[PDB]
């Protein structure tokens, strides 16, 4: 409750807002209105570095005016709320596990507590990027002289795990009393089966689409060299029974199941 300023009609007493919640109530003793709001109901959130790195943790509640949360170090109040156990530092980094609203938090060597290096979780306002300087000279051009080749990995999903379900067994599971009450519910699980089946065949077509752009199975070259370049990894080694790339042999293992 807070004192209310926006007036009411003299005879009118109760005020309900756009959603018809009571914005204010007129006091019956003294016909004075009081603005009414629901107060905070926060969502608890935890920042935590790698358990390998530490066990110290920080917390955020979004619904905070720091006073209106019971017990912190310097509780740093952001529009995202105020956190516990970290400190605001005026330096800037590339963003880390992000708080939001311009705040990012990192498990950093404190660098402020001298050489103890408590590595305390610290919040900060992010650096958009490394600053760069340039001057526009109407008659000066810049030319590069040295060429480089860096190859980068791109990762793209293409399929879906092809799953199917029986309606009867899931819903009832082998009770003859079912499929009579269930039959009353009409054709539901019929389309509930057809839809998934169509999905499955659709991913199958998608897989063929993505990979089978080939014209024909060209024979893999015997020699793994080409004019000096090395391809040995990407091609399938004839020696290895896997008949796939060393890279793909690694890749099948790196993904965890």
């Amino acid at each position: 409750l807070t004192p209310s300023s926006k007036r009411f009609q003299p005879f009118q007493q109760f005020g309900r807002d756009v959603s018809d919640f009571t914005d204010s109530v007129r006091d019956p003793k003294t016909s004075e209105i009081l603005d009414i709001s629901p107060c905070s109901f926060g969502g608890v959130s935890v920042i935590t570095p790698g358990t390998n790195t530490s066990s110290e943790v920080a917390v955020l509640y979004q619904d905070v005016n720091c006073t209106d949360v019971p017990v912190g170090n310097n509780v740093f109040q952001t529009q995202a709320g105020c956190l516990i156990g970290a400190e605001h530092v005026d330096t800037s980094y590339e963003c880390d596990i992000p708080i939001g609203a311009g705040i990012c938090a990192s498990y950093h060597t404190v660098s402020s507590l001298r050489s103890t290096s408590q590595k305390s979780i610290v919040a900060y306002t992010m650096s958009l990027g490394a600053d760069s300087s340039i001057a526009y000279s109407n008659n000066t051009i810049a030319i590069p002289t040295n060429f480089s080749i860096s190859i980068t990995t791109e990762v793209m999903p293409v399929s879906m795990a092809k799953t199917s379900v029986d309606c009867n067994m899931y819903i009832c599971g082998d009770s003859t009393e079912c499929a009579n009450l269930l039959l009353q519910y009409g054709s539901f699980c019929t389309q509930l089966n057809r839809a998934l089946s169509g999905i499955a065949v659709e991913q199958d077509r998608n897989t063929r689409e993505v990979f089978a752009q080939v014209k024909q199975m060209y024979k893999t070259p015997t020699l793994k060299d080409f004019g000096g370049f090395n391809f040995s990894q990407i091609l399938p080694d004839p020696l290895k029974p896997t008949k796939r790339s060393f890279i793909e042999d690694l890749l099948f293992n790196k993904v965890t199941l």
Partner: protein, 93 residues
Amino acid sequence: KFNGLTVLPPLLTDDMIAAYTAALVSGTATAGWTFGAGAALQIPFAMQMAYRFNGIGVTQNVLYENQKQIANQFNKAISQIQESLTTTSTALG
């Protein structure tokens, strides 16, 4: 804050967005189309305009010979778009 509702403010605020846009425009002004490819390299703006025309299908001579008029029309264009968005418009709809 209504019976369980919450809106979360964006990770980036409008100010850093504006800063990014400013950097983009400045880069397109100074370093030209190259800085998208790796590092940036500085080019005079007349050079970049002439190069862009040679990309489109007319030789740089036309642009350099008529630099004044294209500059004027470009300024008038930015002007009229300024006026159009100045007017209440459905472009934002």
